[PDB]
Design a protein around this ligand. Structure first.
Ligand SMILES: N=C1C(C(=O)O)=CC=CO[C@H]1O
Ligand SMILES: N=C1C(C(=O)O)=CC=CO[C@H]1O
Ligand SMILES: [Fe+2]
Ligand SMILES: [Fe+2]
Ligand SMILES: [Fe+3]
Ligand SMILES: [Fe+3]
Ligand SMILES: [O-]
Ligand SMILES: [O-]
Lengths: 176, 176
């Protein structure tokens, strides 16, 4: 049997307007369709964050409204990829990325794939003093809204998780 | 090693403008990045076509400029999904769809996944008189620009492939 499981086409700019109040703290983002293989999200702002995501699959970005940027590790060095309003970008698997979204009213279309069982996501923090990895957690990712907060929260709550194994500096946690 | 395999972010509306001359007959569409798992295409117009695509994976559409529509089979009946300017839409696997793009200067972002070996695409034509399937070809799809034309062309060239097995009507081929 063949039906439109994810419903009919609809106007995207009006959808974003109607969901603006989720596109800001404390929720910040909203998945468009549920139970699909393509995970299609709109991400708003402001939001800053200190974690780097290690995604085993690609991520597509289209910065529809306002500006944002990705903090990256590429070739072993910190780098910044700007997502200016109107930019698209395709992130290869496993490139560590920390999205920074300073602007209220911004909106970024992000498209990712459901990860199959056994294909784990990583979330990493790095030492601001020496660049060493401080902590990494791997998760079988099923839902961004519900599987990521307890993970981030347990990092911020633990001086041990935040302690750099190389230089001893305790990572600040949330605001950095 | 981690590098930006698909390059830096770039402005999408300017990209579309610079490629407009491919976004019209006879080429009509243009893939954004090569060798990626996400196949990201912009599709222009005008183009009409008589084949229905049976994609084993989902397809995402965002009709950025102008209007288009999909002829579908849903629940056993012909249906039309309009892609009005600004619409997004997620097509479930295996829903038969025939994109119609009447407008010059239109532009639709379409995102699909590379199919793994063994996961075949289908291209089907149906009888305008009785609705029966006339012909189906399955392909291991590697490149839309190069694997689809010889397939369509061999249908248009064969009265036998075009002959409805139920009512005997010969399908018109290209213009229908
Ligand atoms: N890239 C993602 C972000 C973001 O702010 O860009 C938030 C939630 C969607 O998917 C992420 O991997
Ligand atoms: N949907 C597709 C189309 C289209 O015109 O919509 C053309 C080439 C890209 O991917 C197709 O499956
Ligand atoms: Fe350190
Ligand atoms: Fe027929
Ligand atoms: Fe990510
Ligand atoms: Fe298709
Ligand atoms: O991310
Ligand atoms: O298609």
């Amino acid at each position: 049997r063949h039906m439109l499981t994810y419903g009919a086409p609809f106007n995207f700019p009006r959808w974003i307007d109607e969901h603006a109040h989720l596109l800001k703290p404390p929720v910040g983002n909203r998945q468009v369709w549920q139970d699909s293989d393509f995970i299609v999200t709109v991400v708003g702002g402001p939001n800053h964050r200190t974690d780097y995501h290690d995604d085993p699959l690609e991520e597509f970005f289209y910065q529809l409204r306002g500006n944002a940027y990705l903090n990256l590790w590429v070739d072993g060095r910190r780098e910044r990829a700007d997502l200016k309003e109107g930019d698209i970008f395709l992130l290869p698997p496993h490139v560590r990325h920390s999205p920074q979204r300073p602007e209220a009213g911004s909106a970024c279309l992000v498209i990712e794939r459901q990860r199959p069982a056994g294909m784990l996501d990583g979330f990493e923090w790095y030492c601001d003093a020496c660049g060493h990895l401080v902590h990494r957690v791997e998760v079988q990712l099923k839902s961004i809204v519900t599987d990521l907060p307890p993970l981030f929260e347990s990092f911020y709550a633990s001086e041990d998780k935040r302690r750099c194994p190389h230089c001893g500096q305790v990572h600040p946690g949330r605001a950095a």
